[PDB]
Amino acid sequence: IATINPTTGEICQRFKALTPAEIDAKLAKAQEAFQAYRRTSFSQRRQWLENAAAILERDTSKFAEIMTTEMGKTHQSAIAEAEKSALVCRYYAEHGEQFLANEYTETQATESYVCYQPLGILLAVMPWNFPFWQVFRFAAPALMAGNVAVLKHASNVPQCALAVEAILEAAGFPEGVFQTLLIGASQVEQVIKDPRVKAATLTGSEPAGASLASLAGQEIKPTLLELGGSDPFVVFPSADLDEAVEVGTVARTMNNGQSCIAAKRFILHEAIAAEFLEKLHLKFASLKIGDPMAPETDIGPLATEGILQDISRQVDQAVAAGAKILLGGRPLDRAGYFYPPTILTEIPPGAKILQEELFAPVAMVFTVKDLDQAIALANDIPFGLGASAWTNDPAEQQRFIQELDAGAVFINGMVKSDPRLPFGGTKRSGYGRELGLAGIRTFVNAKTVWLK
C-alpha cells in the first residue's frame, strides 16, 4: 500500500497494512455502530449525506489533486469526479426515503406490505480508476439505507481511501458507520468470512470479482459485481459523423482510457468508415499528452507500471499477429507511465486481443456491411457492459436498443453513468445494478409483512 505518483514514478508515501486483529476490531466496531445506526431517522442520514456533498462541492480541487497525484487522471476530470460524487450523495439524500417506503399489496390481510430494512455490514472492494466516484456511488445509498460499510480500496489509492472516510466523519456520520481498511487483496477473505459481514460489492477486474463472489457464495452472502467491458461504439450512415467522432474520442480517451464503459471497439458501417476513421485518427493525433495537473492536458500517464506493461504487450502481440498501427502503439520515452492514444485496424480474425479489455487509450477499429453484422460483431465478446450506436433511422435505433447485449445502450451519445438511472453489466461484465432505485434496493432486506 503506497502512493506512487504515476507522472514521475516517485514513491511518495508508504502505509502499514492492518493486521487481522485490527481488521477484526474494525468489524466489531462496525457491528456496534450498525446496532445504533439502523435506528437513526432518514432525517439524520440525509443531513450527514448532504453535509458530505457540501464538503465535496467546497473542496473539489483539493480532492482532485489527491486523485491526480495517486492515479494520474487529469486534475480537471478529477474535479468533475468530485462533483459527480457530491451529486450521487444528493441523489440518495433526496430520494432514498421514498425509494425505501413501504409498498402495500391487497390480500386478505388487514395489512400486507413489503418494507425495506438494512442488512448490516457491507464490504465494498473498489478500484483505482474512479477512486472517489465508485466509492460514493456505493456509499451514499448504503448509508441512506441504514447499512454500515467497510471499504477495501485499491492499494495504490490509499490517500483517496482515507480522504473518503475523513469526508464522511466531517459530515457527521457516527464512528464505525464507514471505515476504510488499509488492506491488501489477500486480506479480503477474512472480511467476507466474518459472520458480521452480510454482503459484498466489487467494482474492478474479473480475477478479483471471481474471488470475492466465489468466497461470498460459499458463505451464503449476496453480491454485486461491476467488472470490465469492451463496449462497442457503432456508427452507421445516417449518423452525425462529426459529433460521433468528437464524442467517440472522449469516450475512448477519458480517464486516460481507464474506464469499464470506455468506447473500446469502433464498429463502422463501410459507407462512412473511411471518413469516420480519418476524422478519428485526426482527433486522437492532436490530444495533449502531459502532466495531468495542467488544465490543458487531455492524456496523463496510465495509473501503474503494470497497466503500462500490460497494454504494451497486448498491442505488441496484436501487431505481431498482423494488426496495423494507424497511430501510437508504443510507450512514450519519458518519465511516468505514459502510453499514447493508439488506433489499431485490420486486426486478424482469432487474435486474442479481440476478446480482451484494453484499459488504456487504444481503439480497435472494424468495418461492417450491414446492421446484422454490426450487432453480431458488437456482441461477439465475453463482456456486456455498455454499448453506443449512432444512427438516425428509427428502425435501426430500435434494433440496436433491443439486440445489443449490454446493460446499457446509448443512441447518439456516449455511455455515461447518471445517478438517475440504474447502471450495471451483463455476461462477464457482472450482475446487479447500482444507481437509481436499484442502487438502494440491492443490499436491503425486503421484508414481507402480513398482519391479520
Place this chain on the structure above:
Amino acid sequence: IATINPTTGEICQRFKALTPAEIDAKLAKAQEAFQAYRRTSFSQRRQWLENAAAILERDTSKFAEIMTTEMGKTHQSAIAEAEKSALVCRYYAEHGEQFLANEYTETQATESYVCYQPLGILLAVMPWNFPFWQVFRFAAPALMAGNVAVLKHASNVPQCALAVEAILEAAGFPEGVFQTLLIGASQVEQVIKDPRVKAATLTGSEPAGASLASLAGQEIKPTLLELGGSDPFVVFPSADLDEAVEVGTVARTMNNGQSCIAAKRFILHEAIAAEFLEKLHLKFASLKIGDPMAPETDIGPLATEGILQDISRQVDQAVAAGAKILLGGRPLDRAGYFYPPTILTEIPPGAKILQEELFAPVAMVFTVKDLDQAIALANDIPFGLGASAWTNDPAEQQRFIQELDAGAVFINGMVKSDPRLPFGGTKRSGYGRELGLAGIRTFVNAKTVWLK
C-alpha cells in the same frame, strides 16, 4: 436417481442419469430455443402459461399422487400444492408483462428508460419437499420473462421432475424452453460452468446452496438462494390462544414438518405458556399418522431414510444433553420412514440443536418473560427466513415487525408464501426474492436506454 416410496421403503423405478455429453446436448438445444423464444410475444407466453395452469387444475389428483408416492406428503396437501402451482402460473400470466414494462425517467435525453430483457438459460436446482410448487414458483416468471430453464430436481423425485416438463410441453411451450435434467448433485458443476448458462437459482439446504453459489461466483453469474430456517412462533399474553395453538400445530406439522417456513421454535410468554403448551401437547397427540394417500392422514412418513436418521440423531443428542421429551421423540416401529410429532422442552443453553433446522415435525419450546427477551431469542439463530408472532397489542406488533430478523414477519397468522408478495430469506437462509414483482425481475437484464 429413483422413486423409492417412503411409506413402504420399496424401490419403484430407477432412472439412468444423463451423461455429460447428453447434458451438453440439452444446453445446446436450450440455447437454440432461447434465440427464438426471446422473440415470442407476451401473448404467446401467457397462453402457454395459462394452458399449464389449466392442466394443473384439471389433473390435481393425479399429479398429487405422484408427489405422495415419491416423497410422502399427504395426498390432500399435494392437491393443494398442485393448485398453488396453477395459481403462480396464472399470477405471472396476469401480471408479468406489466411487471416488465419500460420504466421512464426524465433526463436531457429525448427518451431515457429501463427495459427488461431475458438473460438466457437459467439453471434451477430444486428440492424434494415441494416438488411441484418450488418448480412452478421459479418457472412461471422465468418463462414469462423470456428466459429458458434447465431443472436439476432432487434425485428422489424424478417422476415429479419429468411430470413438470410434460405439463409444460402439453401446454405448448416450445422444445428446449424447459428441460428436466435427470442428473445428480455431482453433475451440477458442469451446468454452472457452461458458457451458455447465465444464472442459477437454488432452493434447498446450505451445503448444496454454498456449492452452487460459490461455483457461480467464480463464473461471474448471479444467483438466488432460498435455504432453511428455524422460524420462531412467538405467542404473547394478548393472543387468541386457541387460534395460535391450532395454527401453530399446522405450521409445525404441515408437509410432515419438512418446510423452510415451518414453525420450528415456539417462544411462549410465561403468562400463557402453561396453557398453550398443554393445548399444543394435546393437539399434536391427536394428529393422524399413516398412509399419506388416505384423506384423513395428517402425518405421512419423512421423505427419505437419511432425513429420518438425521432427526432421530438430533433429538437423541438433545435429550442426552438434558432436553425433555413432552411428546414423541423416537422413530415409529412400522414400515416406512415414520417419525412422530414431537415436542422438546427445557433444552439446555449451548445445546447444538438450538442452532439447527429440524426438518421433521419436531417443535422446540421456550419460555420468555418479556418482549425484549422474545425478540433476542427469536433472532439467536444462523437463519432468518420467516417469523410469526401472536399479539393484539399494536406496540408489540410494531416491534415484532420491525425487529424480528427475518425475510417475512406474520402477525396473528402462520407464515405462508403467496404469489402476490415477495418471498425470501436473510442471514444463512439465503438472499434474493421470489414471487411478486421481485420474482420476475431477478433474472432479467435491466437495460438502461438513453436516446438523444
